[PDB]
Nucleic acid binder design. Sequence first.
DNA 1: TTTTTTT
DNA 2: AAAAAAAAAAAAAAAAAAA
Lengths: 204, 190, 649, 175, 445
Amino acid sequence: YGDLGNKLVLEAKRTKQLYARSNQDVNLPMYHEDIIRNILKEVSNLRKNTEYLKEQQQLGMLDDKVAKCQYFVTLLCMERNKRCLLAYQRLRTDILDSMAWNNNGLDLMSSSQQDTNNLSHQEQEYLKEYCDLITDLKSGDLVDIDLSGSLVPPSDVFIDVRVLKDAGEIQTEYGVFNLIKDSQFFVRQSDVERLIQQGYLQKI
Amino acid sequence: SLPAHLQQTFSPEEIQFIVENEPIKIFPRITTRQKIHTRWQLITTDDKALNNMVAMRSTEVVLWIALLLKQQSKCSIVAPQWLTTKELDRKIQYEKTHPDRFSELPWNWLVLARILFNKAKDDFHDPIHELRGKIQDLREIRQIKVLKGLKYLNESHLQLDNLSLLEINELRPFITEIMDKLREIHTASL
Amino acid sequence: DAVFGDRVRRFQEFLDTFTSYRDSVRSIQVYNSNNAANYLNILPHRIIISLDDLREFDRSFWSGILVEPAYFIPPAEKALTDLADSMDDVPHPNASAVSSRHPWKLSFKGSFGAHALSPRTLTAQHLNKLVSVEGIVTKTSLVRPKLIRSVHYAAKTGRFHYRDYTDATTTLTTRIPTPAIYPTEDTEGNKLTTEYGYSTFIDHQRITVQEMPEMAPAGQLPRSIDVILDDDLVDKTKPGDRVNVVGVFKSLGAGGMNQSNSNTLIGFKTLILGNTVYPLHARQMLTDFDIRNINKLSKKKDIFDILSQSLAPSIYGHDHIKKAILLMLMGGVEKNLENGSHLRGDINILMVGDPSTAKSQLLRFVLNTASLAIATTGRGSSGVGLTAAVTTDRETGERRLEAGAMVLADRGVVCIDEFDKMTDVDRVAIHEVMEQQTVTIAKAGIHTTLNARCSVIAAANPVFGQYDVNRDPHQNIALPDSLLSRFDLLFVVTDDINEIRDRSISEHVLRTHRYLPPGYLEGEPVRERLNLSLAVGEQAGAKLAKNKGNYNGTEIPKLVTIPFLRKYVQYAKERVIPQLTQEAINVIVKNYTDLRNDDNTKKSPITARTLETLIRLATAHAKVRLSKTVNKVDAKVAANLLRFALLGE
Amino acid sequence: MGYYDIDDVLADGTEFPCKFQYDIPGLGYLENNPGRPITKNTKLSLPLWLARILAIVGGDEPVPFVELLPPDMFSTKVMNAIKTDPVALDLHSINSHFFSLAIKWIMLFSEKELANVVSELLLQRAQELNHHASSLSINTNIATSTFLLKLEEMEKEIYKKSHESYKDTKRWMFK
Amino acid sequence: NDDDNTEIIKSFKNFILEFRLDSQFIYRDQLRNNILVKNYSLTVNMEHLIGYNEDIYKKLSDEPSDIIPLFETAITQVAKRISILSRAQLLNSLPTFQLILNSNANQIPLRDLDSEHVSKIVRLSGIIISTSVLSSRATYLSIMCRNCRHTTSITINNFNSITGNTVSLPRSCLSKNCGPDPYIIIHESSKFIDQQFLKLQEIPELVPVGEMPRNLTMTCDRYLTNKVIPGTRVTIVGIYSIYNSKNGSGVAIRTPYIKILGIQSDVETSSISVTMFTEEEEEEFLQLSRNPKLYEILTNSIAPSIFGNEDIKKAIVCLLMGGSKKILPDGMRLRGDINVLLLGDPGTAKSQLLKFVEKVSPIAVYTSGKGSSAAGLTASVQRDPMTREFYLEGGAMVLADGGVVCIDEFDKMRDEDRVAIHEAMEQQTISIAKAGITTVLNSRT
DNA sequence: TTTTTTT
DNA sequence: AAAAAAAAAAAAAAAAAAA
Ligand SMILES: Nc1ncnc2c1ncn2[C@@H]1O[C@H](COP(=O)(O)OP(=O)(O)OP(=O)(O)O)[C@@H](O)[C@H]1O
Ligand SMILES: Nc1ncnc2c1ncn2[C@@H]1O[C@H](COP(=O)(O)OP(=O)(O)OP(=O)(O)O)[C@@H](O)[C@H]1O
Ligand SMILES: [Mg+2]
Ligand SMILES: [Mg+2]
Ligand SMILES: [Zn+2]
């Protein structure tokens, strides 16, 4: 018996559709560790039952065919439970890494989801480790090229930029930009992509 | 990169980039022939033409440099032999008279057309609307031929001798997945 | 031209490829020959093909049939006639019968796909194409013969002459019409006398089929289409039946394209030339292992209560009601005596009770479970319109009786809701049909008695909002005792307020509302579906697939599924006619004498007719256990059930 | 065959009819009264993920514990229905894992007569999928929706991918 | 005579093939997408027609019935040009394409139509009350003679200028010595289209003083059929023309009617059982559904001018959403609606909520309990004036199936009329047994 | 005197 | 040139009856 596991797996499918329709990593939903621990306790029951049945099989009063068929059935049940759990976990890890790869590996809690409370503690420490790896990777031979930069090919040099949020003044190379609220800039493309990804600039 | 399976095909922006990475002829307005000044000394283009240019003489530069100079007043792009009515006419006649072979046309079909129409609106000898309509006619005819040819899809291979870039790009996923499923069925049957 | 010959020979090749149809033809021929002069049934010249085999043989001919039957069916019929003629061998035939020239028209079965429609979906682009439409039978016309080919004789010449007449609806192909003028003069002035008994006449009947109202759009009325069928199958079925008809959908008539038009917005006629008809019935036969399973169930000790509990599992309590319904669905036999006239044979049951105690739901379940049933409401019916109607048929201009509601359900069951809310006038009609099960219509020059042997199940509300248990039972009911004494069994249901029963029924109801159709997720509502893949459809004893009936594990006692129960009812109502014995007589008479003189309060007074109810209940219970004789156990159970229904546990 | 694929995991969960070719005491505990054993030739509806194995183990006449009966989805009725006209068939109604189940069934039992018909079915449906994918807006008929609601789940991803490809190409072309 | 037709067709084809905004030829792309999904139709916006050229608009304004067929055949010529290869020389199952117009002219009410609008394009709006069943009309007729016995084809256009407009049968035969009209119609090998009739009633709030609403008749054909249902506000664009009445009173009478060319509806036939919204609108609906407090937004939005009442508004919203329909293996149905009764003191504005609820719900009817009867709500049995045959016509409660019904003054209705609704609301199916007609009709509201 | 029901 | 009308269903106003 492992039908309950399907209830988990089916749910995961919906989350993928959430990724599919949006086409943007955002608002990962709350976990389902309750059903997971339900499956864990039932599989502990299955394991103890299998151990007991092996005990009586070794005891001599248990039929060999009954013992073997019970063993195979229980083993298949454990196999399906494990498959369901890892099927959930792999997708969760994949979407977590996809989210972590594009935000420069800083987790950006100041400005995706706000609380990140919808993630398990193990998932959060995994996210921290992946951010560590992301920071480490660009610190080696590829220091001159930012791996977490844009992916749109550079098509034009001068674009119009309209302010979205207010700040003070920000220095650049050979100049300084004052982020007055709701103004327009005629600046170089390769200077403001960092701000645009941060959400402080609009109207590319 | 993955970003929702963007790791399997090309986005139209990448196609436009890989097309503008191509050489073209130019008709410069200014002169920078060396005093007999700053060296161009690029890393992915022969700077000799850039350094050795003089006004009102034809020379070859990569496309995006020509576009940048056209954003300024130092450029005059020379259109290819396609972009004229009397060549497109014989081309459409060739498609009409041969209902099975796609006409000979390069990979950069319709992309150079879009870019030149968007930027170099004024340097043409022909009205823009006529050329746009004829290009639209070519697009429709080739689309019809593609639909006609797609009817049969062997599980072994196929030949598409004269498809341009965008036409292949748009059709890649559907065709690939259909033949993958057919191959899976056939192999599973054996 | 020669395309007809090529198609004919190709069809001959196809017929020669398969051997089943030739076997059917020779069986028909030998049966007809055996029925000639050997010390009344005849087999019509029709054979059913399965066009799946035709598709598997030739796609071109199959496509030609299913797209343009006009140019394809007649060649097939001609080839079939030629093959039948060649196989036929009658050295010594008759004279008038040999000139029939029956062409052996065809019938079809198999998968249609996009050509199985509904009366609402039929439209312009489906014309001239073989189709198969489902629906309900609304009304039928009158059988009328029509002429095809006449025979003439002249005394001087001695040469018989024949002229053949065909109309637009007679043949699929349009030809120059011929009037019905009898030619009585030869080319040289000889007198010609029409020879009856040698001419050809075929039956004709028109019916109209209507889409089922259940599958209807949002706030739209059901619609109907016109069907013509002739020759054989001319008077099958009746109004109020679920049918599926396969035929050609064609247009006919000028429609006003001639000078006869009076307005610009005229139209054309549309009509169906039916080829074959099947009883949809939403199948009715018994297999060998089906009979084995029925027998092994019957020989069990406790089949009756299992069958009772099997009825409507979603209704809590009311076990005795379920038992009463089971006994009513398969009631006792009719009795007719050369001197004693007739005795009523089935059971009638009435329900009166406090509101919202699941009476209408059980009545709906009885509607769905029973074979033939019709639903009526007290406020939505008129007594005169319930039994018969005087309407004029359009084609003949003659007024003919139209069957009423309960006449259609003869030998079936009729369920009435809001019975006490009916107009009193209509009630008297009910009494008539409860008196001798016969309705007589004498009006506008028609004097006829119509048979109606149906049983009635009904539910009614008390006079007040709720039943008053401290009052006279007659005080609580608005119906006169004249018809209340007719009903065999009367039940009073009241929802006593007890927290234990409240919790139990709450658990049951909450269990019900958490149900999901198999193979369907819970996030989206129920959608409409397509019909079955085949327009026409049709190792033993070792599987017990649906025989045990226990679909899921919820209680130790067994359960049976609805189709098996209906099969059991069908077997029981035909294969056994039990007879009572003297021991059951002794028990019944003892119980009747005791009950007559118990002399205490009771819900209703008792009289002699209750002994008839005991007899019929014992007969029904004997039918339940499939025995040809009534034993005292059935008398005991009938007495117990009567005591529960009239005294109260 | 992918371990970490959602659709395959879901498709493994469907139930297939099967019969106990062999009689084993003490079984059926997980479905009925545990104390009563299961007698021989008993029909059951077991899930695929265990019926696939229990039909091949043998265990031991090394006959397997279970014998798997032909499922109702693969019936002559459905074969005729799919052959006569596949384009208008609502194959979604028959099952919502039809193609993967077909692949697994044909893998378990090699049958040349299913491969060709299924291949032709999907090949014919692909043309209409392409037809609808090419169409774009710029007042909507029922044909498109009633077709789209009949699809198998595995064709939906092809439809979406093609639709997005065409939409992106159109958007780039017109600016 | 033919030269003018050729010039007009050429001009329309030039307009179709030459009109472009920005970098898009809108109508050619529309034609391609329409042909792909087997919707042989095209939609013309009148403003584009005027802007491209004014003389063609003038000609379309002067004689609509004479001009429209030329355009609707130029469309099919262009479609054949840009969808089928000539292959240096087949099926050709492309009928004449349907032309549908849209415009934004000044509305003209029903009662303002007079003799000066004959054979003119007009725009108007009303309410739909009754719909006729479908019917067939011939477009390509195969005609065979009897004596000479030769075949001929007649092509029929569905536009009528004069009342007759029909060549019934050619006089004499084609070349011996046949009769007047020895021709018959070959029913096989012919082409037929579909036609339907509709009735329009005046909008309630434009009725002039002390009057009764007036009815009008409309004819629709091909794709325009089966698009509306009775009781839905619509906007129609068409031609106002007349047809003679020989079978009919007066002298030289000619009953007028409307030929539908374009229909705009408020519900867009969406509920009439699948979802067809675009991705933008569905995304917006999801975005609103994602709001954490949309319950209060909807509660406030129910009758903003009514002050103070809260639980009643919550109940009204809950009723509008409705329950969840269920079904069971044994056939038992379970109701999926909720029924609310307001039983209050005078002056508390009970009906002011009723008419607003009628306004909000997509399917709603408002009626008084005093002016109602049992036969006038569930089902009414009529009989035809001519053929006398009985038929079933639905009332009010069936007309609002799949929606909600607004009844006020529930007590004033007669006791006999208050018992017919019991089954109609407890089981949602009404049964009729009258004049031999037995029918189980469903009503979900 | 009033409302109900039948003609 | 003519099928045309008896049989039903539904909506009132008057009178008489019961409370
Ligand atoms: N024992 C029961 N088991 C299940 N449902 C029950 C039971 N008793 C009552 N109900 C529920 O009570 C509701 C009453 O519905 P329904 O109108 O059919 O009842 P009723 O007693 O026939 O009422 P009425 O006399 O008003 O027609 C139903 O929804 C039904 O499911
Ligand atoms: N809460 C309220 N806020 C504003 N206006 C109100 C409110 N209650 C009543 N009204 C006013 O009452 C007036 C009349 O109300 P209406 O006649 O619809 O009330 P009702 O309760 O339906 O009456 P009835 O029981 O007599 O049919 C309206 O003009 C409306 O403005
Ligand atoms: Mg009820
Ligand atoms: Mg009011
Ligand atoms: Zn002639």
